[PDB]
Amino acid sequence: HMKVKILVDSTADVPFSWMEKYDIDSIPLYVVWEDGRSEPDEREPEEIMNFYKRIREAGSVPKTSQPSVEDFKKRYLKYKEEDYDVVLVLTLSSKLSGTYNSAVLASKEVDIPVYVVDTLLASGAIPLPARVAREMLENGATIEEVLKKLDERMKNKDFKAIFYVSNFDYLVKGGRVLLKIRVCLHIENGELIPYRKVRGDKKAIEALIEKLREDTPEGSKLRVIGVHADNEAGVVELLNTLRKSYEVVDEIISPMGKVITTHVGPGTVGFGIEVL
Ligand SMILES: CCCCCCCCCCCCCCCC(=O)O
């Protein structure tokens, strides 16, 4: 088979170990503070942790921006020079960011073949189809076949993004959408859909799993990526609760990056779900 590089953007919150394990690179989007300071959303443990403290203490909530066309071109040329034959890019929902269009535009100006997939998802749900793509490629599947299957998986809603936030004001401030209240959301057709408000994390956790249950019977086989915005204990509880009604053949936790955290706010907990 040919050598295929897989690239997701930083809003995919890819598990750190997956970069090497599945040869998945991550392109940084940016966080720009009101004072003009700009910083890349790199998948580095300590850097993300440092960002959590800073956004929690900041006097304002920063804005975010897609990678530049130049940023994408740079990556594509780098992979060509690393002898890759093709580049498979999976971006977050085109309805949530201009990242998809930027990746597509850049793909037109470079020599190496670049296929861009609008996942219509965000955060931890994105690395799921990315890994499925690598597994299929490794077994000799062609790009055309991979794109075909992913399209089917999407049609059957096999990849889900369900989560809840602690302070809804972050999402409102971001533009994409009381005491102890928790707002539960899920991504549908690439858009953020608030579907419930509850009190406390236990109920929020239960509501996330209830939402999953609407089309995925308990006992179903899954692969999961639990995500959190500086609330590891919170997502651990979520996955522990999930294991009691489903057959989780694989799970891993990944911290939400600077860009996702800027929009959802600290305290957020949720999971990317792949229905096997
Ligand atoms: C896996 C479950 C968690 C899902 C979390 C979804 C969070 C969505 C928040 C909106 C992010 C918008 C990013 C805009 C980036 C840009 O500036 O172009």
UniProtKB/Swiss-Prot annotation:
Hexadecanoate binds at T64, S97. Transmembrane segments: none annotated. It comes from the Bacteria. InterPro entries: DegV, DegV_C, DegV_domain_contain. Pfam families: DegV (PF02645). Residues 4-275 form the DegV domain. Keywords: Lipid-binding. GO terms for molecular function: lipid binding. PANTHER family: DEGV DOMAIN-CONTAINING PROTEIN DR_1986-RELATED, FATTY ACID-BINDING PROTEIN TM_1468. Binds long-chain fatty acids, such as palmitate, and may play a role in lipid transport or fatty acid metabolism. This is Fatty acid-binding protein TM_1468. It comes from Thermotoga maritima (strain ATCC 43589 / DSM 3109 / JCM 10099 / NBRC 100826 / MSB8). The lineage of its organism: Bacteria, Thermotogati, Thermotogota, Thermotogae, Thermotogales.
